[PDB]
């Protein structure tokens, strides 16, 4: 994302593979999450993998 | 107030149940805040000070 000001936050756009209602036929899905509710997954250099 | 005009989104989580989420922000993103009148707070806190 891009706001560049710091006076306002944005919400991080995150995407995830979902177990659909017929279980084993996945489809990727996205939702907006407030930043305090999301954490990076690992100490590795990947800045694009996050965990709740 | 929260001036952001959020819009909801639905995601399926296993059979027969849904997980609601935010999917869009209509309009310009803006800051959430609370407003208190200085004219009341300034009086009130010295009133609290005497006590």
């Amino acid at each position, epitope marked *: 994302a891009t706001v560049k000001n710091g006076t306002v936050e944005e919400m991080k756009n995150c995407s995830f593979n979902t177990t659909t209602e017929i279980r084993d036929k996945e489809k990727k899905e996205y939702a907006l999450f407030y930043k305090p509710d999301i954490v990076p997954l690992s100490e590795t250099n990947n800045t694009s993998e996050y965990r709740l | 107030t929260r*001036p952001n005009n959020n819009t909801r989104k639905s995601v399926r989580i296993g059979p027969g149940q849904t997980f609601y989420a935010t999917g869009d922000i209509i*309009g310009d993103i803006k*800051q959430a805040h609370c407003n208190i009148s200085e004219e009341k707070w300034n009086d009130t806190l010295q009133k609290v000070g005497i006590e």
Partner: antibody
Amino acid sequence: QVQLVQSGAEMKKPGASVRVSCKASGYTFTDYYIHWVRQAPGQGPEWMGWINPSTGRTNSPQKFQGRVTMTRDTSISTAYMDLNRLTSDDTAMYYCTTGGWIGLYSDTSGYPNFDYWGQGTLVTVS
Amino acid sequence: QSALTQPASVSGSPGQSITISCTGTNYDVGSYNLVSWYQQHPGKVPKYIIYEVNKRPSGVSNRFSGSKSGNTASLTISGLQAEDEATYYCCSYAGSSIIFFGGGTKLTVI
């Protein structure tokens, strides 16, 4: 004195894209919305979108969503509209206008308060 | 009829008023106080006449006034003089960060 000036008139053949520019002097460029308004010959003006010059958010109506790209350069106080996949219906004068005041605590983007207008520049697809 | 509807033209005598109406729907004109009026003329840029449904910016002669009720707004030009002969558009907020314009209304002072 607040004033805005745009690029010059031009001829362009169908199907191409056009970069029309708008520059304003007399106020801090980041603190007022820039609204794009188009008037085809003799027709009522139609509104294309708005730009937040402070952060770069933009929005467009249903028919224009996906064929006009809008941005700006803060370093030179000049706003840019990039209409793409041109057609004959784009023959019009393109106007740059000054919108509502920008503040953190309220969304004044939708206010149709066009305080000032540019001189208008011509596109003709034929 | 461009996006909003209005009478296309009216002609009258000086001293009276030609009042131009702007119509109309719940989501555009009925919902919000954000209605403006713009005057245009052959070979001219639009002129900014009314804002926030009842206020006028500096430079607009004080013969104008604005009004609104229900789903329809109107522009009052009370005390007509031959300078007012021009094409008048209405435009307002339309929800979801969209704004709509009107079709125009020419004026005459016989």
